Symmetry: D2
Amino acid sequence: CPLMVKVLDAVRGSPAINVAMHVFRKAADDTWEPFASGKTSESGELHGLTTEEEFVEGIYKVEIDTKSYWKALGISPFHEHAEVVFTANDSGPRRYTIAALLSPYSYSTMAVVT
Amino acid sequence: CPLMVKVLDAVRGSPAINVAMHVFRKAADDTWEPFASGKTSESGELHGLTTEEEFVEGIYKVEIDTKSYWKALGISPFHEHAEVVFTANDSGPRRYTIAALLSPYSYSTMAVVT
Amino acid sequence: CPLMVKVLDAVRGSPAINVAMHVFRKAADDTWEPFASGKTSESGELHGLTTEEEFVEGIYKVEIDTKSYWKALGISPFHEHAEVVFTANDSGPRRYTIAALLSPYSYSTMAVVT
Amino acid sequence: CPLMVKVLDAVRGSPAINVAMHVFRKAADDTWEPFASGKTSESGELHGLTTEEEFVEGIYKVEIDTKSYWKALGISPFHEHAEVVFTANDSGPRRYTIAALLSPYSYSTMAVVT
């Protein structure tokens, strides 16, 4: 699994469940093309977005819909979404774990590359 | 000054100086329109981006060029840039401070609204 | 002002006001000695803790009472308090800003040394 | 496994390997008693610190020796260590994951409680 996302809720001390995820890849024309999407599981994780074969060199954007997550909890948050944009596999295939820690007015994102 | 930005370097324990920034407004069209830009000062800050008359309700994107900043220091960073996307509402508070804390493989961003 | 503290609330997007703080110095003995204390201001800040003459090289601990702060808001927090332990060296820079970003189940702390 | 620690390096985008960990429990006399210790694995994790039976109600402190970690990489960091102090199991047994994200002048800590 070359691309995995983990999302945590810092208000509740728990995984962030059912958070929607959309991944885009920058295309030849320099526009964002849809690449994969999904929802986090009860452990706050999303896997199975892609395969090594399809996950070629390129610039990827992971958009996490944090706004809907907080609104469903009764909270009106600051950000519309959290975005993570990065170049992948430009020196050969790698495995990427993207983690996000959410609070209503702040978020942190971390990448582990192996 | 309704919108201020502050950027800190968690590797050297200092303000992040000379970091380029671009601010966009979501165009009725849903296209991003250039709105303001600048480079952070010796104190890691950028203000005077807009005025209260021009800063109307809407969706705004703040794009911080973190990749050029790490490259200047000789460090290979993970992210292409850091983006902060938010709604400005006249309803709530009037002053927005966007802060960003940078590491090569992680960033944290926080909003103070007062 | 060689030592300043700043505390922010990531849940409400505001300074953390009236938060108690205690500063300790490691005693030749390795016992913590009271050194200074105060409550954060309406801007989430605490300064005037010490003077340059009294702030000599040593190991210092800053203890922030985050549990009382969340309890005041009606939120059950995870941590008993947040602690920041560091060496002050005259060698390097002279001014220390300790910042803390609080959530009920997470905190982040950063030092700017200038 | 009721108590697990995960440590990540935000400079290198990797688990933090071989980081020393000490856990203490506050004793009747209100002093810190040694409870368990260990080093993180190649995945940046530490498990097997304790059992449900031994992990009774109480106030625990997890001390992570971040200073030795950064010094071994050639970096002189700000903090002496990272400390996480919390009450555990006061409403029945729970499972605790303590995560820490490290940079030389900043760290973040998060708890997931299940």
